[PDB]
Design a protein around this ligand. Structure first.
Ligand code: HEM
Ligand code: CYN
Length: 343
């Protein structure tokens, strides 16, 4: 059914299988040290595998991303205990900058590093805390990431598909099916992740750190390139300043290819702007136009089935939220409503 997922999951598995600093047995020791708030021990453990002689010259993207993952868990940990990692680990910042250069990603761990690039076995999976809730959080992202990447590709493909073609309805239907995985992620998070443990125990590990004279955010699910998908789908031409700033904030943390997708579509009319213009010119008497628009409305429905329950999850956590979530929700409803009004 979701036949496009495989190639994305295989690209993640390559990084997850890589251990170029031979760090697996070492990183497993980190949760114990975190529980004990043993800052000197955390540094000492990192120095057991941190390269001091620059990066091995035969490394490609896979090795450098895997290295960033394994050092990365130490970065959020050190900052969790109140320390700038670059300040307490001499020689660390150059290695972080070298790995940023090798991966074209920021100089710390991102969501990708800690979820899909992180091996799944109990004797391999890297973790800040070792807690069941952190493991369930990783699983919730693994449920939908590959499917989301397939969805980005489908959205880009749909963008060049005429609403007059029966291919428009078919592509949209297929798109909707991939985006249902985001819904499955939030349902999973609801079932398995305690907001008490999240806010008190996990959230402290996601503070920003300073590298290269700026601040880089911690590896949250917010970094999922869903904002790129919707930039193409409906948001590229938005003049809403809060929204624009949101997208620009997280842009540095997504894969290079999705930063390029983002740039390609910026300014330019979004998919639904073009679709609705096409519908207004040709008319909804055209069977394919009607079917296309109907299928497109279902795409917005599934986005809303992710977004509204995600907002309640976040509020339940903050109870024991950032206004941006409410505003994005509002924008999504208005986009869907534009699609409905065309019908
Ligand atoms: C208890 C768990 C969670 C909490 C408390 C939470 C909270 C938040 C918060 C506060 C934001 C706004 C940015 C920020 O301040 O970090 C955000 C954004 C976002 N989060 Fe979560 N989140 C949780 C789980 C998840 C999961 C499981 C996913 C998907 C697998 C997810 C996906 C997203 C996305 C895509 C955004 C961007 C906003 C949007 O697209 O609507 N989050 N979340
Ligand atoms: C959601 N980070």
């Amino acid at each position: 059914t979701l036949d496009r997922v495989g190639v994305f999951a295989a690209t993640h598995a390559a990084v997850a299988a890589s251990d170029p600093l031979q760090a697996r047995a070492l990183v497993l020791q980190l949760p114990g040290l975190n529980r004990n708030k043993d800052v000197p021990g955390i540094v000492g453990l990192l120095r057991e595998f941190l390269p001091v002689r620059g990066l091995p010259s035969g490394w490609g993207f896979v090795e450098a991303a895997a290295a960033m993952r394994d050092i990365g868990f130490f970065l959020g940990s050190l900052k969790r205990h109140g320390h700038e990692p670059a300040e307490v680990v001499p020689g660390l910042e150059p290695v972080l900058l070298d790995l940023a250069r090798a991966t074209n990603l920021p100089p710390r761990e991102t969501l990708l590093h800690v979820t899909v690039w992180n091996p799944t076995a109990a004797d391999a999976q890297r973790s800040y805390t070792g807690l069941p809730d952190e493991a369930h959080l990783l699983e919730s992202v693994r449920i939908s990431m590959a499917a989301l990447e397939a969805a980005i590709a489908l959205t880009v493909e749909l963008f060049d598909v005429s609403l007059r073609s029966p291919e428009f309805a078919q592509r949209s239907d297929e798109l909707e099916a991939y985006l249902q995985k985001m819904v499955e992620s939030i349902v999973y998070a609801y079932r398995f992740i305690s907001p008490q443990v999240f806010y008190d125990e996990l959230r402290p590990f996601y503070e920003p750190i300073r590298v290269g004279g700026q601040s880089y955010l911690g590896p949250g699910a917010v970094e999922m390139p869903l904002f790129v998908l919707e930039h193409v789908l409906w948001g590229s031409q938005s003049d809403d300043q809060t929204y624009r700033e949101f997208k620009e904030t997280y842009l540095p943390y997504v894969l290079p290819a999705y930063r390029a997708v983002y740039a390609r579509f910026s300014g330019e009319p979004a998919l639904i702007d073009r679709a609705l213009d096409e519908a207004r010119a040709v008319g909804t008497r055209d069977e394919h136009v009607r079917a296309g628009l109907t299928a497109l409305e279902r795409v917005f429905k599934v986005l809303l089935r992710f977004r509204a329950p995600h907002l309640k999850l976040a509020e339940r956590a903050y109870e024991v939220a950032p206004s941006m979530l409410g505003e994005l929700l509002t924008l999504t409803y208005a986009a869907r409503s534009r699609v409905r009004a065309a019908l």
